[PDB]
Amino acid sequence: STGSATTTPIDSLDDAYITPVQIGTPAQTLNLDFDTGSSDLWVFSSETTASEVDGQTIYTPSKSTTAKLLSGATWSISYGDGSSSSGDVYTDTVSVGGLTVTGQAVESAKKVSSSFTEDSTIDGLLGLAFSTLNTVSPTQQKTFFDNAKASLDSPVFTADLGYHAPGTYNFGFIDTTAYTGSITYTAVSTKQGFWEWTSTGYAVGSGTFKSTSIDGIADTGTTLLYLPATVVSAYWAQVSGAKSSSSVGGYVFPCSATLPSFTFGVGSARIVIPGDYIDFGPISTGSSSCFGGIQSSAGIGINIFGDVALKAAFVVFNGATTPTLGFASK
Numbered sequence: 001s002t003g004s005a006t007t008t009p010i011d012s013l014d015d016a017y018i019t020p021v022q023i024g025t026p027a028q029t030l031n032l033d034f035d036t037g038s039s040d041l042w043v044f045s046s047e048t049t050a051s052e053v054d055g056q057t058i059y060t061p062s063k064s065t066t067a068k069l070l071s072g073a074t075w076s077i078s079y080g081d082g083s084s085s086s087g088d089v090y091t092d093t094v095s096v097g098g099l100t101v102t103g104q105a106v107e108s109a110k111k112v113s114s115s116f117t118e119d120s121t122i123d124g125l126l127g128l129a130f131s132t133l134n135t136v137s138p139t140q141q142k143t144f145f146d147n148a149k150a151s152l153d154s155p156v157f158t159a160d161l162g163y164h165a166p167g168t169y170n171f172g173f174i175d176t177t178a179y180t181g182s183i184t185y186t187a188v189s190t191k192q193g194f195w196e197w198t199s200t201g202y203a204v205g206s207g208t209f210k211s212t213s214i215d216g217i218a219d220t221g222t223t224l225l226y227l228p229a230t231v232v233s234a235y236w237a238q239v240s241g242a243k244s245s246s247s248v249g250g251y252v253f254p255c256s257a258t259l260p261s262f263t264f265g266v267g268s269a270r271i272v273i274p275g276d277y278i279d280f281g282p283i284s285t286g287s288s289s290c291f292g293g294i295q296s297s298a299g300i301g302i303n304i305f306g307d308v309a310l311k312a313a314f315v316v317f318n319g320a321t322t323p324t325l326g327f328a329s330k
Contacts, residue, residue, distance in 0.1 A: 001151045002172035003099025007034065007161065010121040013280050014307060015223050017161060018121060019169055022095040023106055024064030030057050030123035034169055035221030036159065036195050036317060037304070039133035039143050040077050041094070042085055042107035043124035044116075052112050055120025061108065067092040070139075075107045077135045080222070080300065083115040089136055094144060096126075099171050101148050105134075105141035125221065128157065128317065133193035145171070145319060155319045159220050160330070161311035163277055179314035179328035184269035188323040192302075194219070195317060197325050199305070200267055202227075204235050205260030209270070216303030218310060218317070218325055224280070225262070225273070226297035226304040235262055235294050242292065248283050251292035255282060262294060264309060266327040273312040 007019040018031035023043065030043055044056040061067035067090045076086035087110035094104035109124070116122065127134070131142045149155045152172035160178050161167040168178070189196040194217040201211040214227065232251065236242040238260050242253035253259070259275030278293035293308040316326030 001099055001148070002153055002170070003095075003097035003148075004168060004170045005097030006166050007169050008166045009162065009164065010119070012164070014161075014164060014311065016119075016122065017167070017220070017307070018123075019096070019126070021126060023059050024061070024092050025066040026064075027095070028059055028064065030059060031121065032124045032126040033122050033221060034128055034159075035125045035219070036128040037217060037219035037221040038077065038079065038125060039127040039129045039131055039193065040075060040107050040135055041105065041124070041126045041144055042075065042077070042087070042109055044112070045087070045108040047087060048109045049111055052117045054117050057123045059106065059108065059124075061090045061092065061106075064092055066102075067106075070105065070136075073105075073136050073139060073141075075135045075137065080304075081115065083113045085109045085112040085116060087111065089141070096144065096171065097169065099148060099152075101144055104144055104147055105136060107136065128220070129195065130190050130193045132190070145317075148172070149319055157317050157319070159310060159315045159317065161220065161307055163274075163311050167311070174316060179330040181329055182269075183314070183316055183326040183328040184266045185316070185318070185324045185326040186266050188325050190323060192217075195323070195325055200265030202231055202265065203263040203270075204238050205275075207238075209263065209265065211265070214264070214303055216297075216305050218305050218315060220307060220310060222304045222306030223308065224304075224306050225278075225294045225308040226300055226306065227294065228303065229296045229298045232294055232296045235260070236292065244296070248289070248291070250295045252283055252289045253292055255288045255290040257290075264305070269327065271309070271313045271327055271329060273309060277308055277312060
């Protein structure tokens with residue numbers, strides 16, 4: 001089997017991407033944030049505190065003839081940005097782009113933090129990291145991809161995020177028309193439950209490539225590119241007027257600037273992030289100070305190859321017995 005679904009930026013900045021997901025019988029379609037940095041599939045629901053729902057589409061398990069309460073199961077998750085959600089668990093039929101899993105754990109939110117309430121475009125998350133991170137207790141649950149894996153033509157999914165435009169998540173196959181050149185594969189450590197790999201270095205604009213190992217995670221659920229302070233300093237030093245602002249919470253730059261590209265290494269291959277991808281617009285409406293798409297990972301504890309990086313590539317998440325990551329230009 002295979003699946004193929006279009007993923008769409010939620011706003012003009014590509015702050016996140018939503019992908020339609022069919023849940024239950026008859027289908028209830030929710031737009032979920034596919035997140036290779038977490039491993040819970042959770043949804044706004046009929047159980048969600050009513051004051052914490054503001055525009056989202058909800059899953060109503062009582063209207064699904066295939067929904068079954070997973071007795072005693074609860075979940076609770078906190079994300080790197082400080083947002084959180086929690087609730088109980090159903091199993092139900094979940095389909096993504098024609099690909100169907102029966103008995104998928106669908107985690108029903110009873111509570112969500114303000115950040116989720118305030119984002120009316122995101123109806124929940126579909127986690128695609130390793131199932132070892134799944135927060136369901138007392139019986140940990142498998143991700144959609146883990147459940148689908150055996151049925152897939154090939155145990156892979158691919159992320160093809162668009163810059164200010166729709167893209168694609170494919171399951172079970174590699175679309176050889178979706179990228180240019182070759183796919184370069186690189187080793188993954190699952191030790192922290194993430195798609196964790198080591199970039200071989202970086203370049204700023206037309207500058208020379210610096211060979212240096214950068215351990216990080218491929219995370220579709222993080223908007224920006226978070227790298228070591230040395231790297232990030234080297235990047236923003238090439239932008240006149242750029243500075244790290246503690247009041248804003250990161251590097252800002254004059255909106256009048258033309259940003260240089262940023263290249264990261266995948267083995268011997270190179271992925272080029274165009275400068276425009278690194279512009280996240282005015283810090284506040286009408287401001288001439290713009291927020292940078294490359295930020296320091298210092299104090300995060302891990303480097304994150306978020307959407308800013310991933311959207312510059314065709315990315316293969318290879319879930320073979322020994323997982324790997326593949327990157328191609330496109």
